[model samples]
Target: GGGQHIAIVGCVHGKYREMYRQLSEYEKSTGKEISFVICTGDMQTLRYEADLVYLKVPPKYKQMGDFHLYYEGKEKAPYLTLFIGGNHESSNVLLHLYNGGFVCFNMYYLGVCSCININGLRIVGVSGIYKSFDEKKPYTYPPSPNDVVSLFHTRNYVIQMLSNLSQSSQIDISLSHDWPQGIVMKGNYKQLYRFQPGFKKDGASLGSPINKVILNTLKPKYWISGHMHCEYHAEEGPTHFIALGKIGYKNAISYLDLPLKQKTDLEYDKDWVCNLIMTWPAFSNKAQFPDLSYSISELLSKRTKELDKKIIELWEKYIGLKIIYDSDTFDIQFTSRRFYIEKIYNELNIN
Candidate 1:
């Protein structure tokens, strides 16, 4: 299993300077080729003209245009950068209305759009107005009736287009904003309703309700999300919950290792292919230094070993099966293939 390291960042908020710094550091440490960077919306703090009146717009990020320019030396520039919609950024048409107007912030101007695929992963991003709205904060909910129309049109159009792709020939991951209702909704039948879990207070209390919805829509194996400003994982079914521990500003980047597999008859068999390792910003209680050096060291130190043992024990007890584990570091191939293969061999006593 060849290793592929991908980075996922949450809410750049016009902090490309710091983001670029972090990327350089990560590349130096991992020693793996940086596959791609995934942004879960909020590219700019606020640069759109309509953002002045948008209730959800954070006061600090509000600007009028001319953000930052993404440059990589003289010869190389980013071929493609994947991004989604945050409430701060306008929809595609809204930006189009201004003939491709700038958001007026000090960040790279990603044309208004949420969600895109990278390396065969079907990633979906939702804009602010398009996601679930709080009934109490009417202003923050649907920026305007026109915003509503734009959101609806764009959301449905993207979903339908992605859904129509041949299942076997399409992407592998689907990410979005507002934590798709299917994963957190409470009711059922004719109309589905959402129930968001409280942050910080109820961090470990809830599981993703959107997991199933996404599985139904894209049938993907992984889903990455943001807006909660926290990093944690929850699984409702086959899909894995990928939450970026907020990095920079107020979060730590979430790093994930996903194994590429082709299921066989006996069990989930593994093949030596490309594995995806992602890093995104997430909020962590242990945050100390700006660069998170302490946090990273702690996770890799003896403390991580103790936690790993407990994790393995709990997993075996919960699933009622013996399981083997590998390094908690950035070894995607070990976590994705070798560990499971060893477990199966040990179980069957295959010499």
Candidate 2:
């Protein structure tokens, strides 16, 4: 009856062992039980060696980490972990879940823009950083060579989706991979100079303006980020904006507690449900961009009884996947994964 303990980490960069090791120290030292781990972004959920090709990191950084062990079920995460995507990721699988769903039994990706309830915490997350030019583009799978990396770029439709949720509900926490614009002035900018000296030039406002508007609107009590790989703490009005360094850096790990008498299964945020339902058709059929003046009024209305049944069956339909990797067939799984997503849409009857 005390509360649910959530351990928050900045970025994984595929260092699962190091992440868990640090969390263990925190738990053993503090003697507090952690309900689950929340990663700001850059967790890199690579399920196989071939999956590494989907990661957009430099060729030098492509060695597989400990993530495949968890994906194969050889090892299990000590705490159920949730993460948003960063600019760098295994897009082959992540691109499949625009609405967010499980990657493996113990890990979940928070979708490009998502609002979901975890136990008692109503968490909203937007994957990738903002690039205004690319934000308006449609959802392109196996992104053309010219824009292959765009798979993780934050999109406008989703930002508008997040914007719509604020009209109907208040969020407990929001996570993004990048910091908000003008956040530097609200924090200790001097510390940033030591990390990225380039900040001296454009130091006034260095992050996503899109995210800045998001923070001002939603006012989630806690807003966390992991890009820039530097520690930052700022109070943007009543909201606490905290940015953490990469793994092994100071302030990269922290804890937040929410008042939940008992832990429950991750529940759907009705507003997010509305956003997904409202956006899915256009998001899926985007020849170019889609209209969205209907977002707010449409989102404020609760979901229907029909969708309520479909939503309950949603996870079970998609979450249970065979960890089948064909040693001989390199590209089969990749192609089939896309089919998996299409099948889910077809089954949901929303396609």
Candidate 3:
């Protein structure tokens, strides 16, 4: 037997009930089993009641949708469904699972950027819409209230990881919430504009530019996305790109049957190894900074001491130190301060 049929849908936007309902009808009509469902983010709407304040188009009922059904244990996903994060999501919940984890029964969320193997298929995805300015900055967790406005801005580090991963492996499918910027022009622009007039203006800044970088580099067989709420398809080289419409809207869902293949290890081949060697100089220059010979703990301890000394000097110069403690207590406090500083230092380095 071959690999099972897979169905790919666009932004669910908390309309899982309607989306699954249509999937059932389509399965019945086609008489084929859909073994897996891949949702391109915006799956849950009610992250927190406060999130409603940020929504441009808030839900009608606060807690009476498909997301609520699964959340409240009233229903379980009919099949294995995987999703990515979109702009509008429970920023708090997804932040905890930034490395990717389960959202509900048989529903998976691909965190900021991730790649996984399911039933011998190599699925890679980058969540979030593209914000040109935010791309260069480090990812922030428990994003600030102001940062929440563009929570889906894909970061550069994530793209770097994805790029490095793609250099060594072949991706079968790539998913994202937004389309690649210029992908629509490859298809019928006239039709896309007809469906949504704002597409031209939006399409000008429509999709993630990082997505374009990944698509061009990885060259997956299929690139699937949702966000534009308009169905558009195009082909570039060997990759077939499909941008699905929103779940509640007409022509929102899409399906595909992927072939089963043997799992490939992450081992770099001769070509990749040679490429690595060729790029060795560039990497070593950037990586060897601050000395690679020192153990991580030792380096962190040194950095902490440096920072502690700086803080003490600044405090002494700016604010006179009060003689509130004995010599022994002062020594104890200094040690405790350095300990906490080291802890933060290590955590920041590791994350």
Candidate 4:
């Protein structure tokens, strides 16, 4: 209701109807100006095979891309309706690919861009599908090589598009699921390019490690994404990783309050790194559940202890604090956790 600009979004497999309904409700209720509605992929149900129609077809006689026409009818075109293609749309090449480039099926109804600016901050959306192509193969439980190839080709197209954008307009926050490797590959070649240890063929966890690499490269202040269907936030140096849970009909929307700039500082004490634990509301009525579950807390505590021991070992091995503080300040040193301690400790030591 305040003078703040807000971005609303909806997501789920084959839930555009519900999404459109909710957006209408939001506009009606807020009565405040809306920046735009961003759809974080999965706008349709995927068939993958060419013969299946019901999974990919809408019963309303709506044309393949007529989904966005609903928003267009409201004359809300000025505020962009951004749609990210999901796994569901990957079923048909005719619907998913166009003009030698992969275009969303919803493109005809709404204006779509890989990245756009919201009040000067760049927020990019990527329809992330990690799979390969196989010419002689059929759709399988474990995606085929053909699926991976298709996804890889599509991802390259996306990365190239974003790469061409001006540096000043470089994506500050990426709203995506399957993290792209281009950003990480752009930064370091020596860092392991092969999938993480336990990952089989194409089933891998690219979001976290790729995020770490991208943060090390682009240093974006905020990175928001979905698809994991879990609410999470992880900080790596100056960048923040925010993963929002699924939001469609009857699903609770996860909210984040962010500052115009990176809020927590990160250039001071090595002993004071930032780590966080956040939780969703519990199933009970009391709302008394702790944000951090015992197991998660234990894991974090273990990581901290391991990091502390490693830091102490490094300090013992090397007399200079440069490795830890990096010229009196390091990105890891300035997190809120460290600041709180240093503010007290430094004052005490000086007194």
**lDDT, residue 248, model 3:** 73
In candidate 1, position 89 carries an lDDT of 51
Give candidate 1's TM-score.
0.49
| Overall lDDT per candidate, in order of appearance | 0.38, 0.71, 0.63, 0.37
Count backbone overlaps in model 1: 31
The ten-residue window of minimal lDDT in model 3 covers 267-276
* Candidate that beats the other on lDDT, 2 or 3, i.e. the better one: 2
Pitting candidate 2 against candidate 4, the one with the higher TM-score is: 2
Which digits, one per residue and each the tens of the lDDT, describe model 1 over residues 273-328?
00000000111111211123223223222223344344444334433221122223
Pairs clashing within candidate 3: none
Which stretches of model 4 miss by more than 4 angstroms? 1-4, 8-10, 27-31, 45-79, 90-113, 132-166, 179-216, 249-351
lDDT of 4 by residue, 122-213 (tens): 55554545443421122222223334334322332233223322343345565555443333333332333332323222333444343334
lDDT per residue, candidate 2, 210-313, as tens digits? 78888988999899998888778899887899888788777788888778844667766765654554444444433333444335345334456577456446
Q: What value does the lDDT take at residue 199 in candidate 2? A: 78
What is the model-wide C-alpha lDDT for candidate 2?
A: 0.71
